[PDB]
Amino acid sequence: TVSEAQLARRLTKVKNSRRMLSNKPQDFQIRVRVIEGRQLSGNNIRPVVKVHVCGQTHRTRIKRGNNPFFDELFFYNVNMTPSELMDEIISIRVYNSHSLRADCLMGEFKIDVGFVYDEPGHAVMRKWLLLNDPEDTSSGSKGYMKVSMFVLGTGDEPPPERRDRDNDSDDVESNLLLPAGIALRWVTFLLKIYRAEDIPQMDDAFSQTVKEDKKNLVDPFVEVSFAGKKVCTNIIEKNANPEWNQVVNLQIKFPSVCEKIKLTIYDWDRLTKNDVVGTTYLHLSKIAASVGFVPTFGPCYLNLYGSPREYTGFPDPYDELNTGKGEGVAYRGRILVELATFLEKTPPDKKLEPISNDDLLVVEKYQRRRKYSLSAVFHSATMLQDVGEAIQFEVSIGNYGNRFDTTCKPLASTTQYSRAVFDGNYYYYLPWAHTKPVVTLTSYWEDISHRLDAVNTLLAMAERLQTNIEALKSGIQGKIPANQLAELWLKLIDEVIEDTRYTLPLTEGKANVTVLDTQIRKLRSRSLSQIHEAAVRMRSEATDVKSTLAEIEDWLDKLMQLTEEPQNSMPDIIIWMIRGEKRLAYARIPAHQVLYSTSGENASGKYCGKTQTIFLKYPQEKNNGPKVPVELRVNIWLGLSAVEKKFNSFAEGTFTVFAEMYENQALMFGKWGTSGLVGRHKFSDVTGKIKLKREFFLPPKGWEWEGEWIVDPERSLLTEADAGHTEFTDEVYQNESRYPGGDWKPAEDTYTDANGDKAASPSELTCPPGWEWEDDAWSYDINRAVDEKGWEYGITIPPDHKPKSWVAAEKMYHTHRRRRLVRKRKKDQEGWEYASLIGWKFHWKQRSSDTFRRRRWRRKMAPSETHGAAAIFKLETPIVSCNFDRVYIYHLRCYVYQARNLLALDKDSFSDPYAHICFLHRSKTTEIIHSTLNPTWDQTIIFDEVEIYGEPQTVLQNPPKVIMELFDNDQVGKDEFLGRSIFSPVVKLNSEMDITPKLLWHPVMNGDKACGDVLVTAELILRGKDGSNLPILPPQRAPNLYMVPQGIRPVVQLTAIEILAWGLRNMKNFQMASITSPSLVVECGGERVESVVIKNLKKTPNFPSSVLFMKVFLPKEELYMPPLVIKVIDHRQFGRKPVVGQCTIERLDRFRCDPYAEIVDWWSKFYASSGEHEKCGQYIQKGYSKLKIYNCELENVAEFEGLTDFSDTFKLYRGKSDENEDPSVVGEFKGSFRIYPLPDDPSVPAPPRQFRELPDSVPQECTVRIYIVRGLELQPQDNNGLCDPYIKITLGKKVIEDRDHYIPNTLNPVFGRMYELSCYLPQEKDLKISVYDYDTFTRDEKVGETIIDLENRFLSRFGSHCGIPEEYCVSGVNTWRDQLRPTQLLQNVARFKGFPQPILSEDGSRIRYGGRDYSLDEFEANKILHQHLGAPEERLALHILRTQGLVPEHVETRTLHSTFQPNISQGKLQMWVDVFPKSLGPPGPPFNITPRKAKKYYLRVIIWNTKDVILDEKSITGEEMSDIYVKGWVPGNEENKQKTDVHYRSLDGEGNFNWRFVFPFDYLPAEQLCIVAKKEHFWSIDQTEFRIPPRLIIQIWDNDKFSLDDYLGFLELDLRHTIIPAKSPEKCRLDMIPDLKAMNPLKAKTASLFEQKSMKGWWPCYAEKDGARVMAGKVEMTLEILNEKEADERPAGKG
C-alpha cells in the first residue's frame, strides 16, 4: 500500500539519524512557540493552548475569537538520553475555556520530538498543524495551529527566519507540517510474547525447604514500554520457564512514532518491590527498510544481560545492569517474541489477547534445539596485579556452563586453580607454559546459522575492505607514488568485485526462517547487487581515487549496517575469572565471532579456532580503568556437535586427559607402611574421603591408553624452572600477626613467596647457576597501596585463618601486616610427597616434622586416530589440557619514542611519566623523564627470547597485544595512572618481510576518553637457531639503554620556530601572590628559548620584545611533529622560579608556513536588512544602504578566521587534574607561531622573519561603544513564563548595569540602548555582556552571558574595531561613526598588507591601490547620490574597503551562554561593539538605535444596515423577534467593546443602526503589527506590551431586552488582508471568505486597509454548527482608517 511505503521511508529517515553516540547524560532544550490559530471550531469560543512536553505542561493566556493570536514561546529544559528524547512526544492540545467552568476539549495534535530533530535547520519553521479531536477523529479537523518547534542539543544553534511572508503566513495548504498524503491512520504493532527460559532465581528460597524444583523460584511477567505506555502480562507463579502466550497490541498514530520498544521481565513479589530480571530492546528501524517492508521480527529469542545470577538476600550492587543501563555481565535468560506491523482495525480495548492456537502450532518450528560443542584453549593470562589467591577461568554460554548452580550435574566447564608467578618486572602471569588448560562444555541452541553465515561473511568483507582502506590511507599519507596507489586501488576494487558476487544462504529448506529473514535477505541481495554494479561501473569509469574515497567510505558504513542482525538468538560466551570463590571479571565474546560454518572460512567467525586477545573488565566498569584485571588469550571454537569432527582442522597441539589415583602411607619405627591410616583410605581420591581403585578408570569411546600407569612426582620440577627470563627482580614478603589491640609479633610464616606458603629468609636466598646478584642488600617497596613504611594491613575473622584483602591504613581491628621486599638479579625424590599430617598439604621434600606421605599414580590417555582432537567433546572429573610438542622463540623490540598531552598528576603542573611495556609473560620499564607532560624517552625495549606457543602463522594472524601502561612517577606515595595504549606489533618470520616498522600515534586511553597519544611501534621477529637472523643492536647512550635506531626514528631537519610572545592575560594568583614578574619559555624537540622577563605585568601586560627565535631539529613528516610546550615562569625573590602555567599545542599544521610566500532612523536600516519588512514602508528606494546581519558571532564567521589572525588563543593550566579532565585555567597566553625549514649550512642565507609589522605593545585607552539592539528568544526566569530583562555589562573594574531601565514583561526585548565605557586594552579586554531578570522581592536570575575579546577587535587585520558601512555619509542618521576617514583606513590596510601607499588623483575620482586602479564609476552605478553623502574620494575609498574582506557594518547575533545549560543557547543578543582607541583621535557621532515610538491610529467603522440575519426562536411577545444589535471590537482591546442601538420590529433580519465605532490603537507600519499595553491582572508588577496583528472582530447579537443574551454570528477582518466586499447585498453570498476544512480551499480576493483607506460594501457574518458553516447574515460597513493628524482634521462622534 501507499501507507506502507511512506511508513518505511519515515523509518529509514529515522534510521539515518539513529547513529549518533548516545551519551547517558545530555542536556536538551526544546522551544515550542504557538503563533496563530485559524478556523477553530465552535461559536463565541475562548481558545487556550496547553503544550505538554516531557511531563511539563505550559499554558498560554486566554484569547477569544475563532482566529486567535498568541505569539508566546515556551521553554522545556530536560535532561535525558538523546535517543530517549526522540521517542518522547510533544502533545499540543487546544481547549475552549470558560469563566466559571472547566475547560472543554476542542482539539489535539501529537508530534514527536524526532521529526523536529531530523528536520533540516534542526527544527521546523512556522508550519501549520492539522488539529483533530482524539475521540471524534472521524468527523474531520477541528482547527489549525501555526507552530514553530525547535530542538537545541549540546552545541546546536537555531536558524534564522527568511522574510516570513513570501511562502509563509498565508495559503496554509502549502505550509502543512504533514501533507495530505500522510494519513492519520493508526499503526498497530502485534508484539507477541510466547515464553521464556533460564530465568534466574530471585526468591528467598527458605520457605521451600520446609516442604521437605529449586531453580523455579521466580514469578516472571513482561512489562513493555512503548511511547510512554506500559502494558504488563499475567503472572506465572513459581516457574522459571513461563508459558505466557499473550499478544500485546501496541498502538501509535502516524504523526507520532516511537522507535525503542523496551521489554523488561520483572519478578513479581508479594511484599517487597518487583525485582528486575533483564531488559532487551527492539529497534524498529533495524527491522525495517525502504520495495521496502514494514517492521517484522521473530519468532526469535532475545538474550537478556545484567547482574550475575547468584541470588543474594542483600541488594545486588550490579542491579543497575538489569535495567538495560550498562552492557550487562551475565546471562539472565531469554524471551521468545514476535512482531508484526498492521495499519488498520485499531483495537480500542483489547490491549491484551491470548495467542491463537495456529500461532502456537507455527511457533514450534522456531523452538527446535540443536546440540552445540564449544572448546576453549587458554593460551596466556598475563598482566595480573596480585598473587594472593588462586585464579580460575570459567567458560559459559547461556546458562550452560555455570559452575555455581550445583543443583544439576557439573559440566566440567572450568579450569583448575592456577597461582600466578612474577614476571620479573611489574606484573604477574599464570604459568601455563606448554600445557594450556582446555575447557569443554555442551549447550543447546537453535540452529540460526542461515543468519550468522551471512553476518560473518559480510563482516569479513567489511574487515578486508577496512584493511585495504587503511593501506590506501597509509599510501596517501606517506606520499607513496601514483603507480603504487593505482595498483592498490585496482586491487581494492578487484577485492570488492570478487567479494560482492557472494550469494547469501538460501532460506528454502530451513525451518528457522522468519519473515524478517526473507526481507533481510532481499535487502542484502539488493545492496550487494548495487555495490557490485557500482564497482564494475567505477572500475571502468573513474580514474581519480581521492574522489572515489568518499564513496568507498560510504560503502564501508553500508557494509557495517548490513551486518546488523536483530535476530541473533545465540547468547554471548561469557568468560569469568574466579579468584577464590568470587566472580571477579568478565568478557562477552559474541557467539557469531567464533561459530564454525561448513559453508566456508568466511562464513565462520573472525576468531573461530583462532587465539583472540580479550581484555576482561570489572562488572560495572564501562572501560578499562587504572587496573586491567587480566589480559586473556584464548582459542575459542564453537560449532554444531554433528560437525565437531571438523574441529581437527582448527586444533593445534595434542589434547591430553589424565586419570589420577592416590595411595597414602604413614611412618612408624623408621619404616613406611600402611598402618595408622585413620579417617583416610589407603586407596582414595584427591581429598582422601572417597575410596577409589586403579581399575575404576577406563577410557570412553574415542580415547585410548598411551603408555602404562606411572608414578608422577615431577610436578614440582616441570613448572617452567624459572627459565623464561634473563633479568628478574625477586620478591620476598614478610608477614606478622597480632591480637586485636595487642602488640605486633612475627608469625609462624614470617616470610612468604609466590607459592602462598612459608619460605626461606632473604639472607638465605642464593642465585641459580648462570645467575648473579646485582645488589647485595634488600630494600622495601613504596610503590604500592601501602603507607610510608611499606606496610599494608588486613583483618581475620574466624573460621578464616588468613586475610583475603589488604588496605593502606592501620586500624584497631587489623590483625595482620605485610611488607614487600625486592632485590634485582642479572643473567627426597623417591616418588612421594611428604606432610606432617594425614590429608594435609603435601610438600616436595620431607621436612623435620613430616610423618605421612602420598604419591600420584597417573596414566596418560591419548585420542584415537578414528576421532582425532574431537574426542574431547565425547567425554560427557576429567581434566583436558592441550600439550604443544615444540616451542617457538621470538624477539620483540618496542620503539617507544615520545608521548604528547599526558595528564598533569603533580602539584607543580607536570608529571614524571614512564612506561610499563608488557607483552605476554615479559615486562620491562622505560626510564622516567622528569617534569614534563610531553616526554621523549627515545628508547628501544628489547624482550629477548619470548616463548610463544602455536604455529608462527597463528601469531601472524592474531599477534599478542603489546600493552603499555603510562604512570606518573612520584617520590613519595604510589605512582598514579596516566593511561594505557594497546597496539599490535608487526610480525616477521623470515628475511623476505624485512620492511622498516613505522611509528604510529596510538591513543593513551584513561577512563573513557583519550588523554593523549604515544608515538610507538613494535616488531616481533621469529628467532631461528640463534640470533643471526635478528638485526643489529641499536646504539646505547647509556648501559642497557638502547636508542631508537635510524630507520625507525623520524628523519630530522634543521627548521626555525618563531614565537610571537605577545602577552599574558588573566594571570591568576599563584601561592596567594600576584604574577608580578612573568616570563615565557617555549620548548620543542629538547631545545628551549626564553623570552625577556616582564618587570611588571600589571603596568605592562605585553612583552618588551615580542619575537623569539630558536633553531630545532624537527621531523620532516607532519604526522611525526612533536608537541610545542609553553611554560610560564614567575621570577620572584631569593632566586625562586616556579611554573605558574603550562599548555600543550599539538595541532602544529596551522603554524607551518612558506617563508618566501516615512521618517528615517537606524531601525529603517535594521528592518530592511532583515528582509521581513520589505514592500511596506521600505526606504531602500531613496538610495540608502543596508547592514550585514550575522546569525552567529563575529568570531564564528569563517571570513574573519575567528579574529585571531594576529595572535591565537591558548589557555594555560596548573596543578593536578582530577578525574582526568582538563586542569584549572589559571591564565592565557596570546601568540602565534611560524615554523619553516632552514638550510643546513650558512652558505645559503636565512629565510626572512615572519613577524615584521608588529603594532605597539604599550597599553592604549579605548572608548568602547556597545550598541545593544534587541534580544531574541531568551530563557524565561519567572513563574509566568516571562522575563523582565535588563543589561549588566562588566568590563574590567567598571561595571555598568541598567536595572533602573529594565524592559517589563517581554521575552523578545527591544533594548536599543548605548553603554559607553573607557577601558585600557589589553588589561581590560574581557568585555562581559550579561542579561539579567529583574525581580522585585527576590534575587535576580542570569539569563545569559557572553565574552568579547576587545583586543581581538582592536588588533585584527580585518578591521573588526568598527564595521565599515556601504556608503559614506556625513549627515542624517547614517553619519560616519568611525574616527578615521575611509582614505585613512585604506592607508592603514595598504601599509598593513605590504602594498605601497595609495595616491589621490588630481580630481579625487581615482585612487591607485594594491597594484590595481579603481574608478568612481565602478561602484556608484545603480544608486542614488542623495544629499547625505560626503566626499566622493572618501566614498570610493570606502568602496575599495568593502572588497578587501574587512568586517562590514554588522549586527552579530551573539549566543547567551550560562551554567544552567553549558553549551546550549539560553537566548540570543543581536548587538555590536565598536572599539575606538584614543591614539588616532576621537570617534564620530554615534548611532541612535533608540526604538521608535508607535504612531497613533484611529480605526472607524460605521454599521448602516443588516439583512437576512437568523431570526430568534421566541421572545417575550411570542414571535420571531430577533432584536438585532451589532457589537464589535479590535482584539487586544477587549475592554473597549462598543455596541450599536437595538433595532426593533425585525422579522426578516432587517436592521438599521447608523451607529459609528471608534477604536484607537498604536501601530508600527514597518513591522506590520500593532501594540496594546495592559496589565495581566490587578496584582501584576508592571505592564506588558502585546505584539498582535491588526484585525477587527465583529459579532451579530440578539438583544433580548427582557431575556438572556443570545449569539447570532461573527465576522473577522485582518486589516492587512481585508476581503473585497460586494457592492450589493444580493451579490454577497456564502464562501467568498476563505474556507479551510469544509471544502477544497480557494484563496480570497484581499486588499490592505492601510494602503486602500476606505471603501463601502457588504460583508457576510457566519456561525458554524454540526461541522458546517451557515450564513448568519450580512452587514453593511464603510471601513476607514486614519492617522493622528487626519483624525484631528475631522472629528467623529458616537464613539
Ligand SMILES: CCCCCC(=O)OC[C@H](COP(=O)(O)OC[C@H](N)C(=O)O)OC(=O)CCCCC
Ligand atoms: C535467610 C533468608 C531470609 C529472607 C527473609 C525475607 O523475607 O527476605 C525477603 C528479602 C529478599 O526478597 P527479595 O525478593 O527482595 O530478593 C530479591 C533480591 N533483593 C534481589 O535484588 O535480587 O530479604 C531481605 O530483604 C533481607 C534478606 C537478608 C538475608 C540475610
Ligand SMILES: CCCCCC(=O)OC[C@H](COP(=O)(O)OC[C@H](N)C(=O)O)OC(=O)CCCCC
Ligand atoms: C503564578 C503565581 C503564583 C503565586 C505567586 C508566587 O508563588 O510567586 C512566586 C514568585 C517567585 O519569584 P520569581 O517570579 O522571581 O520566580 C523565579 C523563578 N521561580 C526562577 O526560575 O528562579 O514570586 C515570589 O516569590 C514573590 C514573593 C513576594 C512576597 C512579598
Ligand SMILES: [Ca+2]
Ligand atoms: Ca523476589
Ligand SMILES: [Ca+2]
Ligand atoms: Ca518473586
Ligand SMILES: [Ca+2]
Ligand atoms: Ca524483591
Ligand SMILES: [Ca+2]
Ligand atoms: Ca603525582
Ligand SMILES: [Ca+2]
Ligand atoms: Ca610525579
Ligand SMILES: [Ca+2]
Ligand atoms: Ca525571576
Ligand SMILES: [Ca+2]
Ligand atoms: Ca522577573
Ligand SMILES: [Ca+2]
Ligand atoms: Ca527571582
Ligand SMILES: [Ca+2]
Ligand atoms: Ca433570543
Ligand SMILES: [Ca+2]
Ligand atoms: Ca430576540
